[PDB]
C-alpha cells in the first residue's frame, strides 16, 4: 500500500487548494486532457475524486510525484496523515 | 470541537478587519496563492467564508495560529464568543 | 406535511441570502462536503434546489433547524408563507 | 404590480444617492450582511440591481419602506415616475 | 427569419452593455429566474449566448421587444447589422 | 387529444426553463424520485423528453397541472401553440 | 435480517450524499471497479440500487462497515429508521 | 434635449465658481449629503462631473433650477453656449 | 438594541466632527489600521458609514466607548436622539 | 425650516465679520477644534460654508444661539432677510 | 478524405475556443438542438468529440463551413495542420 | 484595421487624461451607464481597457468620434502613433 | 519543449501584471473573446491558468509572442527561469 | 528567506511614507503601470500589500533594491526589524 | 505603552506651536518630505494627526526625541499629562 | 532614456517652485484641466508626482519643453543632475 | 373552422371594449362606412353582432387580423376561449 | 378554517393590549356601539371573548383586518400560533 | 383613464386654494367667461365641480395643464392621490 | 436587390430635404449638369423621381454613396425602411 492509497478518503476530503497541485503535476504526470478533465469538476472533493480515478495508471514514481506536490502545498495535512498511520 | 469551528458562523459574520488577520497568517499558515485567493473575494463575510473553506487542511496548530491572529485583532469579539460558550 | 415541504417552490424562488442560512446550518445539519456542494451552484434558486435535493435525509428536527435559519434571515418571507397557508 | 416593480428599470438607472437609501433601510429591512453585500458593488446602477435582486423576499410592507426611503431622497424622480404611469 | 436570428452571432459577439438590455426585458419578457440565470454568466458573450438559449420560447412579439431593447442601447450596432443584410 | 399531447414535440423543443416547471409540479404531481430522475438529464429537450416519458401515468388532472405550470412560465410559447392549433 | 436489509427501500430512497459513503467504503469493502461501476449511475437512488445489487457478496462485517459509513454521513436518517423499527 | 445636457462638456470644463451654484442649489434641489459629496471633489471640473453624475434623478424643474443658478453666476458663459447652439 | 444601533442613520447623517471621535477611540477600541482606513474616506457620512461597518466586532463595552466619545463631542445631537426615542 | 436654513445662501454670501460671531459662539456651541477648523478657512464665505457644514449637529437651541450672534453683529443683514421672507 | 477528417484527432485535442465556432455554425449547419447538445458537454475536447459525432450527416459543403469557422477562430492551428500534411 | 485598434495597447498605456475624453464622448457615443461604468475603474489604464471592452459595438463613425476626442486631448500621443505606423 | 511550457507552473505562480501582457497579446495572438474570457478570471494565477488553457492552439510563433510579452513586462522573472533551467 | 519576506507583515503595517519608496523603485524595478496601480490604493497598508502582491516576480536583486529603498526612507524601522530577527 | 501613545489624543488636541517641534525634529527624525507633508496640513490638530500617522515607523529613540521636543516647547502641557497619568 | 526620466526621483524631490514651471508649460504642453489638476495637489513633491503621472503622453518635444522650463527656474538643480550622470 | 367562428357567441357576449378593436381594424380591414355602421349600434353585444354580420366577406387573413386585435385588447378572454376548446 | 378561529382560545388567553387592536379596527370593521360594548368588559380575556362573540357577522375580509391588527400589535404571539399550527 | 378623472371626487373634496389654479389656467385653457363662471360658485367644492363640468371639452393636453397647476399648488394632495392609486 | 431600389417608392415619397443630399452627392457621384437638372424639378417627390431616373448608370458604389447621404440626412426614415424590410 502507498501513502496516497492509504489515506485516499482523507486526501479527497481535506485537500483544498487542488489547482496548484494539478499545475505542479501537469506535464510531468498529467496529460493536458486529463488535467483539464479533472479541473472541469465543480467541487474540490469531486476534483480530487476524479484525480484519484485517473491515478490507476500511475506507477509508484507518479504516486511519489503527487505526494511531493501535496507535501509542498499542504504540509500540515501530510503531518496529520502520518500521525494517523 | 475547536473554538473557530464552534463559532464558525459568528466569526464569518462579525469579523471585519480580515486583511490584517490574513497578513498575520500569510507565510506561517497561508500560502501566497491561498492568501490572494481568499483576498480576491469582495465582501468581508465572503472573505471569511473562503478562509474557512481553506481551513479544512489546517491542523490544530494552524487553528491555534488563526485564533491568535483573531484574539490580537478583535479581542472584544473573542470575549463575546467565550461568553456565549 | 412540513412548512418547508409545503412552500418548497416558494422558498426556492424567493429566498435570496442563501449563504447565511447555509452557514447557520453548516456543522449542525450540513456536512462540510454537502455545504460546499450546495454552495457550488451558480444561481440562488439553484442553490436552494440543491439544498432541497439534500433535504431528503433530514429528520423533522433538521427541517426545524432549517426553519429556524430561514425565520431568522427572512422573517418577512416566512410571514408571507404563513399567510398563504 | 407595485411602484418599485413597475419602474424597476427606471429606479435602477436614475437613482444616484443609493448609500443614503440603504442606510435608511438598514436594520428595519436590510440585514447587515445584505446591506454590505449590496454596498460592495462598484457602480450605482449595479448597487441598485443587487438591491433589486435582494428584493425578492420583501413583503409589500418592505417595498413600502423602500418607497418611503426613495420618496425622501429623490422626490423629483418619484414625481417623474408617477407622471409616466 | 428574424433580425435577431439573422445576426445571432453578431449580437453575441458585439453586444457589450447586456445588463441594461436585460433590465429593459425583465418583467415584460424575462422571468426573474431566467433573468438572474442569464445574468449569472461571467462574460458578456456568455450572457448573450444564455439569453439566446432562452430565446427559443419567445414569440415574434418578444423578439420585437428584444430588438427594441437593443436598438435603444446600441443604435450603432443595429445600423451595422442592417448594412450587412 | 390533450394540449400537451398535441404539441408534444413543440413543448420538447421550445421549452427552456424546465427546472421551474418541475419545481411547480414537484409534490403535487411529481414524486421526489421522478423529479430528480427527470432533472438528472443533461439537456433541456432531454429533460422534457424524460418528463413526457413520465407523463404516461398522469390523468387529465395532472396534464392540466402541467399545462398550468407551462402557461405560467412561458405564456408566449402557449400562445404560439394555440395559434398553431 | 440486518438493518440495511430491513430498510433497504428507505436507504435507497432517502440517502443523498452517496459519494462520501462510497469513498468511506472504497478499499476496505468496495473494489475500485465496483466503486466506479456504482458511481457510474446517474441518479442517487440508482447509485444506491447498484450498491445494493453489489451487496449480495458482503458478509455481516461488510454490512456493518456500510452501516458505520451511513451512521457517520446521515445520523438523522439512521434515527428515523430505528424509530420505524 | 435640455440646455445643461446639450453643453454638458462645456459646463464641466468652463464653469469655475461652483461652490456658489451649489449653495444656490442646496436645499431646493441638492440634499445635504449630495451637496457635501459633490463638494468633496478636489478640482472644479471634478466637482461639476460629480454634480452631473448626481443630475440623473433631477426632473426638468431641477434642471431649470440649475440653469437659473448658472445664468446668475456666469451670464457670459451662458451667452457663449447659446451662441454655439 | 443599543443607542448607536437605534439611531445608526441619524449618527451617520448628523455627526460632523468625526476625526475627534476617532482620536478618542483610537488605541482603546480602534486599531491603527482600522482608524486610518475609516479616516481614508472622503466625506464625513462616508467616514461614519465605514466606522459603522467596523462596529460589527465591537462588544457592548466598545459601543459604550463610542457613545462616550459622541456624548463628549456632540452633546446636542445626543439630546436630539434621546428626545426622538 | 429655521431662519438660518432659510437664508443659508444669503448668510454665506453677505456675512462679513465672521470672527466675532465665532468668538460669540465659541465655548457655548462651538468646540475649540471646530472653532479653529472653521477659522482656518481663507475667505469669509468659505468660513461661513464650513460653519454651515458644522451646523448639522446643532439643535434648535444652537441655531438660536447662532441667530443671536448674527443679530448682534449684523442687525441690518437680519432685517434684509426678514424683509425677503 | 477531407481536412477535418484528416486531422480529426488534432482538432479534437487542440481546439480551445469551441463556443465561437459553434455560434458561427449554428443556424447555417447546426440545428438548435444539436448545437445545445454539443454545448452541453463539460470539457472542450468532449465538445469537439460530440461535434464530430454530429458531423456524420454533413455534406462536403458543411465540412467546408466548419473549416471556414476554424480557419477564422484558430488560423495558427490550421497552419500547423497544413504543415503536418 | 482602424487607428484605435492598431495602437490599442499604446492608447491603453499612454493615455492619461481619460475623464476629458469620456466627457467628450458622453451622450454622442457613450451612454450614461456605460460612461459611469468605465469611469468606475480605479487606474487610467484600467479605464482605457474598460473603454476598449465597450468599443466592440461602436461603428466606424464612433471610432472616428473617439479618435477626434483623443486628437484634441493628446495631439502629441497621436503624432507618436502615426510615426510608429 | 518550449520555455513557456517548461516553467508553466512558475509563470502561473509568479506572474503578477497579467493585464499588460494580455493587452500586448490582444489582436496579434488573442481574439477579443478569448482575451475577455481570460480577463474574466478573478485571481492572477487563475488568469494565467486560463491563458495557458487557451495556449493549446498557439503555434511556436505565438508562444514566442507570449515570451516577448513576458520578457518585456517581467525581465527579472525571465532571468530567474533561465537560471533554473 | 529574505528580509522583506521575513518581516512582510511588519513592513506592511509600519511603513508610512510609501510614495517615496515607490518613486525610488519606479523605473529600475517598478513599471509605470505597476507603479500607478500600487499607488491607486487608498491606505498606506493597502499600498504596501499591493506592492507585496507585485513582488512575486522580483528576483533577489529587486528585493535588494526595495531593501535599499526602505533602509534609506525608514532607517529606524529597519533597525527594529533586525533587532526582532 | 509610551508617553506619546498614552496621551495621543491629548497631544493632538492641546499642542499649539507645532512648527517649532517639527523644526526640532526635522533632520534627526523627520525626513524633508515627511516634514513638509505634515506641515502641509491646515489646522494644528490636523498637523499633529499627520505627525502621529507618520510616527508608526519611529523606534523608542524617536519617540523619545519627540518627547524632548515637546517638553522643551510646552513644559506645562507635559506637566498636565504626567498629572493625569 | 531622457534627462527627466533619468532623474525622475531627483526632480520630484528637489524641485520647489513648481507653479512657475507649470505656468511656463501651461498652454504649450499642459491643458488647462491637466494644469489645474496637477496644481490641485497639496505638497510640491505631490505636484511633481502628478506632473510625472501626466508626462506619459508627452513626446520627446514636450519632455524638452519641460527641461527648458526647469533649466530656467532651477539652473543649479540641473547642474547637480548633470554632474550625477 | 376558425377561432372567431368557433366562439362566435362567446366573443359577442364577453367582448367589452369594442371601439378599440374597431379602431385597430379600421382602414386595414373595415371600410369607413362599415366601421361607422357597426359603431352606430347601441349596446356592445349589438356592436359585436353587427361586426360578425359584416365578417362574412372577410378572408382568412382578415379573420386573423381581428384575432390579432382581440388578443391585444383582451388577452384573458382569448385564454378563456382556448381553454374551452 | 381561518387563523383567528383556529387559535380562538389562544388569542382570547394571550392577547393583552386589546385597546390598540380595537382602535385599529374601529370604523373600518367595528361600529362605535360594538367598539364601546366590547371595551366595556372588565378583563382583557373578557374583552377578547366579547370581540369574538361580535365576530360572527364578519366576512373573511374582516377576519383578515383583525389578523392585520393582531400581527401589528403582537408579532410574537402570531409567530407562536403559526408554529403551533 | 387620466389622473384628474381617476381622483375626480378626491380633487373636488380636498382642493382648497382653487382661485390660484384658475388664474394659472386662465388664458391658456380657461376662457374669461368660463373662468368667471366657475369662479362665481360659492363653495370651493362647488367651484371644483363646476370646473369639472367644464372639463369635458378639454383634450389630454389641457388635463395635463390642470395637473401641472394642481401639482404646483398642492404637491401634498398630489402625493396622497398617487399613493392611493 | 439594393436598399434604394427596394424602397424606391418610399424614398421618393418621404424624403424631404433633398437639396442637402444632392450637395452631398454633387461632385463625387452627380455631375454638375445632372445635379442642376434634378434640382430644376419643382416638387421634392419630382426631384427624387428625377434623381432615380438618373440612378440607372450608378454602380453599387454610387448607390452606397447615396445611401450614406440619406442615412446622414434622415436617420429616422432609414430606420423605418429597415423595419419594413
Author numbering:
A (entry chain L), B (entry chain K), C (entry chain M), D (entry chain I), E (entry chain O), F (entry chain P), ...: 1379 to 1463
The authors write:
NLRP1 and CARD8, two related inflammasome sensors, are highly expressed in a number of cell types and play important roles in both host defense and human diseases. NLRP1 and CARD8 mediate inflammasome formation through their CARD-containing C-terminal fragment (CT) generated upon functional degradation of their respective N-terminal fragment (NT) by the proteasome. In general, inflammasomes leverage supramolecular filamentous structures to nucleate the polymerization of caspase-1, which in turn increases the local concentration of its caspase domain to facilitate dimerization and activation. Here, we determined the cryo-electron microscopy (cryo-EM) structures of NLRP1-CT and CARD8-CT filaments and analysed their assembly and specificity.
Similar to the CARD8-CT filament structure, no UPA density was observed in the NLRP1-CT cryo-EM map, suggesting that the UPA subdomain, with the 25-residue predicted unstructured linker to the CARD, is also flexibly connected to the core NLRP1CARD filament. The NLRP1CARD filament has one-start helical symmetry, with a left-handed rotation of 100.8° and an axial rise of 5.1 Å per subunit (~3.6 subunits per helical turn), similar to other CARD filament structures. Strikingly however, unlike any other CARD filament structures known to date, the NLRP1CARD filament is composed of NLRP1CARD dimers, rather than monomers, which is also reflected in the thicker dimensions of NLRP1-CT filaments compared to CARD8-CT filaments in both 2D classes and the 3D volume. The inner NLRP1CARD filament is roughly equivalent to other CARD filament structures, and for all NLRP1CARD subunits in the inner filament, the dimerically related NLRP1CARD subunits form the outer layer of the NLRP1CARD filament. The total diameter of the NLRP1CARD filament is approximately 140 Å, with an inner hole of ~10 Å. The NLRP1CARD dimer is mediated by reciprocal interactions at helices α5 and α6, burying a substantial ~300 Å2 surface area per partner, and involving residues with large side chains such as Y1445, M1457, W1460, and E1461. Different from the CARD8CARD filament, the type I interface in the NLRP1CARD filament is more extensive, with type I, II and III interfaces burying ~300, 430, and 140 Å2 surface area per partner, respectively. Charged and hydrophilic interactions dominate the interactions, including R1386 of type Ia with D1401, Y1413, and H1404 of type Ib, R1427 of type Ia with E1397 and D1401 of type Ib, E1411 of type IIa with S1395 of type IIb, Q1434 and D1437 of type IIa with R1392 of type IIb, and E1414 of type IIIa with T1421 of type IIIb. In contrast to WT NLRP1UPA-CARD, structure-designed mutants including R1427E (Ia), E1397R (Ib), D1401R (Ib), E1411R (IIa), R1392E (IIb), and E1414R (IIIa) compromised cell death measured by both LDH release and caspase-1 processing.
